[PDB]
């Protein structure tokens with residue numbers, strides 16, 4: 001009838017985790033800190049014919065090694081690993097987030113998608129083939145997004161749902 005999916009968004013400060021969440025759930029964007037994140041946690045949508053409830057867990061505001069972040073990683077069925085294409089440090093941080101999920105889950109088979117956000121901005125510092133190479137070594141897809149123009153937003157979240165379905169189907 002309906003299927004629920006627990007999706008967790010991780011990544012460094014200001015990469016756009018919350019803006020991506022609000023765009024998906026509310027079809028809304030503002031170029032400032034957006035307090036409507038407090039009301040943006042579930043989207044009901046049909047994906048490939050199936051009525052799906054997407055519950056989005058946003059790690060924004062959590063310390064790097066907090067107990068609530070650990071709970072988020074235990075609960076999540078799939079993870080968006082977000083960096084910003086104009087922030088080199090946020091791309092270098094991706095290894096840490098991947099390792100933290102793998103250790104908390106005690107598994108090497110966790111559904112994940114690598115997301116390069118802020119693709120609408122000029123003067124990038126992270127090149128696509130750098131991210132494509134990383135995603136290949138993880139065995140996961142890579143998707144370029146903009147929370148502002150909505151580029152790739154449905155692609156990123158629905159691709160993660162499809163990865164979860166493949167995992168559940170053995």
Ligand SMILES: *CCC(=O)NCCCCNC(=O)O[C@H]1[C@@H](O)[C@H](n2cnc3c(=O)nc(N)[nH]c32)O[C@@H]1COP(=O)(O)OP(=O)(O)O
Pocket residue numbers: 011012013014015016017018019020030031032033034060061117118119120121145146147148149
């Ligand atoms: C964030 C650090 C900083 O000082 N930025 C300078 C502006 C400060 C106020 N503006 C702001 O915080 O904007 C948000 C968001 O609107 C913007 N953002 C997010 N995604 C995109 C995008 O795809 N394209 C463009 N042009 N802007 C985008 O970045 C900041 C932070 O976004 P967030 O979701 O709050 O970040 P977090 O990962 O949840 O911490």
